[PDB]
Design a binder for this molecule. Sequence first.
Ligand SMILES: NC(=O)C1=CN([C@@H]2O[C@H](COP(=O)(O)OP(=O)(O)OC[C@H]3O[C@@H](n4cnc5c(N)ncnc54)[C@H](OP(=O)(O)O)[C@@H]3O)[C@@H](O)[C@H]2O)C=CC1
Length: 182
Amino acid sequence: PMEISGTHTEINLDNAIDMIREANSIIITPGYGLCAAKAQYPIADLVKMLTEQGKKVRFGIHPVAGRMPGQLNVLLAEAGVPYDIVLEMDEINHDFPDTDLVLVIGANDTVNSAAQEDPNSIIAGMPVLEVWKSKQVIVMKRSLGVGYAAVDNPIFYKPNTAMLLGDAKKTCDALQAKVRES
Ligand SMILES: NC(=O)C1=CN([C@@H]2O[C@H](COP(=O)(O)OP(=O)(O)OC[C@H]3O[C@@H](n4cnc5c(N)ncnc54)[C@H](OP(=O)(O)O)[C@@H]3O)[C@@H](O)[C@H]2O)C=CC1
């Protein structure tokens, strides 16, 4: 007779819009989920608009994000994301504690805090994008399901993390449309 509970929070599009417009510095950490949904385009256009409003918007790429090395770099460039704002993990990782908002779009293992928090984790020690150190995290995926490493992500239950559930393309399209309504 054993039980363990986990509490996560879910936000709506309007709340996500509020957090986005409230933020001045934004880091986006894309993963396989963005690749699967082909969501590079709506996020590229969103970034473009947010940049035009004076916001600091950049991408943080894990060396092993997606299914191929450098896959996210290719897809973001295909969407026309300026190369200057596409940074690698080792360059951008130190900026997390000083960032207002992190949009985790279709990423999980690459942003899994258990790598540093759970000494008995199968991914313990593995370098990750330290997204949880930012003021606010929005995790954009279809649910609280696992990634490739088939492991639970403790960031889903962190106070500063909000889940924005749904297909990456669908969510990014909606956020792109609402921000355009200005
Ligand atoms: N890059 C490489 O060379 C290779 C990488 N790998 C491994 O793959 C992983 C890559 O990391 P990363 O991609 O960040 O983490 P994951 O691949 O583990 O996570 C991808 C997440 O995206 C979500 N997702 C899938 N489809 C959609 C969708 N259409 N819309 C929104 N979300 C979606 C899934 O959650 P949900 O179901 O809830 O939507 C899933 O948790 C690493 O663990 C790495 O070890 C392995 C071999 C090669």
